[PDB]
Amino acid sequence: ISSVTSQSVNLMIRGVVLFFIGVFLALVLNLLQIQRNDVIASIFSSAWWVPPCCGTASAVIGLLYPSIDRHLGEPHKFKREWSSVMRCVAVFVGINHASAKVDFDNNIQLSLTLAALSIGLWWTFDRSRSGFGLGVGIAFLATVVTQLLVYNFLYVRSWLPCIFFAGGITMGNIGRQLAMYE
Amino acid sequence: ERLREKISRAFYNHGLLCASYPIPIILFTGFCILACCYPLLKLVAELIPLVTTYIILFAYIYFSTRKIDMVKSKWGLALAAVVTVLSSLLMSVGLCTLFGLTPTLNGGEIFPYLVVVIGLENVLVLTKSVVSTPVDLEVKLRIAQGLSSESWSIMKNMATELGIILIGYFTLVPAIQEFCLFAVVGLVSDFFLQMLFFTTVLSIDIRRMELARLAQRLIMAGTVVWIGILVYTDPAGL
Ligand SMILES: C[C@H](CCCC(C)(C)O)[C@H]1CC[C@H]2[C@@H]3CC=C4C[C@@H](O)CC[C@]4(C)[C@H]3CC[C@]12C
Known part of the structure; x- marks a missing residue:
């Protein structure tokens, strides 16, 4: 059973690392967008919704793209080499x-x-x-x-979608490449 | 149509030219780059993203070189590669100052995105093309064939980048107009200098490998230029 556990937990750790990277990324970009109004404390804003949502969405995206590729058909074969991902x-x-x-x-x-x-x-x-x-x-x-979640005309309605999409593509790429690792 | 063949033929002839004699080409390019730079010298929240961007950059470099490495090629190749892009970048800005430009942006912050755009694949592709060429009956005709074989992909990729950046310029916003211009010029410079310099240094490295010394002069010149570039960047965006 240890060998099967090796594969399962490889998947696990991969999703985990992806999670942490997504956390880091949302943190940073939020810090960026807020530069128009304790530096560590100033960075740690919006403590409730964002870190979970971005991280988990990233990790699931990553886990997901490769597995549907595999259980459907051919994997990817393109510039998808570390360099292109960076x-x-x-x-x-x-x-x-x-x-x-x-x-x-x-x-x-x-x-x-x-x-x-x-x-x-x-x-x-x-x-x-x-x-x-x-x-x-x-x-x-x-x-x-x-x-x-806002029931509770600006950038609020414009860049959210496209950036969501781009983040999805990027995360799925990172996942398929980290899978081609193994 | 047969255009591609014609291209290759003449391009292949240019290869025979590129390596017929390496030095004049170097001196020429060095003189031109310096004479294009000449004018440049005489005429917490906001931090962390910038620095991490610089980090992403460095690691991108380390990666595309670890992947770039091929047999009978020294490490310094990547150094030359760095130098290439850097020098090209400079050739752009200093030339833009010649026609009349409003340098509103900080070069220090942008330089990474430029690098990322022009990239480094357009040289590793051909190094792979040539090193695959056999190691017997030629040291020069070797690169000749290696180059003749990728002309079409080269020019197609360049034309695509041109289309991209022209579309960019067509967005009436000024900042991006300016950036698109910088990138198109860095692009053309990459094209020209890549050929004239990288081709010849690859020729001489393959000569010093088969027969078994220009990478020393390339490395030293490029290190001086990189120090100068670090200097020109550190004082404008701080
Ligand atoms: C990375 C992309 C281009 C590459 C993507 C593609 C698909 C064309 O290859 C470029 C296009 C526009 C660039 C921004 C333009 C203006 C600025 C303002 C400046 O103050 C800071 C940099 C920034 C935001 C540029 C970054 C690079 C961008 C996104």
């Missing part, structure tokens, strides 16, 4: 950065830019006819669940 993360931060540190005359420019950008990204770091599907699904879902 590249993806850096671009992800860059794009999340554009969200705040810049001002546009309208919303259409913002939304169109961001959509076309995530599009270019995808075509650049994964050309899967599938990735699109799950990315957009989870974008949809996180957007609507956020729209609901």
Whole structure:
């Protein structure tokens, strides 16, 4: 039974590490977007909702993409090499950065830019006819669940979705690559 | 159509040129890069993302070089690779100052995103193409064939990046207009200098490998240029 436990717990630790990375990432980007209004304490804001949601969504995304690939058909075979993944993360931060540190005359420019950008990204770091599907699904879902948790016209409705989608793609890539590890 | 063949043919001829004599090409590129830089010298919350970005960068480098390494190639290759991009980047900014530009942004923060965009694959691809070429009956014709074989992919990738960045420039926002310009110019510079310099240093490394010394001069010049670049960056964004 120890050998089967080895595989199961490899999956486990992989999801765990992904979780922690997602925590780190949400922390950082939130720190970024709030720069317009104890530095350690100043960083530790929004203590309740975000760390769990981002981390768990990341870890599930990661766990999920490879397993549906495997239980459906061929794995991926593309630039998906460590280098390209680091590249993806850096671009992800860059794009999340554009969200705040810049001002546009309208919303259409913002939304169109961001959509076309995530599009270019995808075509650049994964050309899967599938990735699109799950990315957009989870974008949809996180957007609507956020729209609901606010029952209790601004960036609130524009960059949330595209960044959700991009984070999904990035996480799924990291997961499929960490699986091709083993 | 047959265009590709023609390209390869002439491109292959250019390879025969690139390695016919290595030195003039170097001196030429060094002189040009310096004469393009000349004008540049005479004319907590906000932290953590920047530094972690620089971290991502360094590790990206270490990775694409560990993967880049191939047999009969020294480590310093990656150093030269670094130098390449850096020098190219500089050639851009200092040349932009020649026509009239408003340097609103801080180079110190941006430099990473530039690096990430132009990337380092467009040289490892050809190193792999050439090293695969046999190690018998040629040291020069070897790179000749290795280059002739990837011309099409090279130019296709370049044209795609051009399309991308042109679309970018077509977004009426100014910051990104400026950035797109910097990137397109760094791109063309990568193209030219990559060929003229990296091709020749690969030729001479393969010569010193088969026959068994330009990586010393390349390394030293690039280290001086990297110190200069670190200096030019540290004083503008602090
Ligand atoms: C990483 C992407 C491009 C690469 C993605 C793709 C798909 C084209 O390869 C670039 C495009 C726009 C860039 C931002 C433009 C302007 C700024 C403002 C500046 O103050 C800080 C950097 C930033 C946010 C750029 C970062 C890199 C971006 C996102």
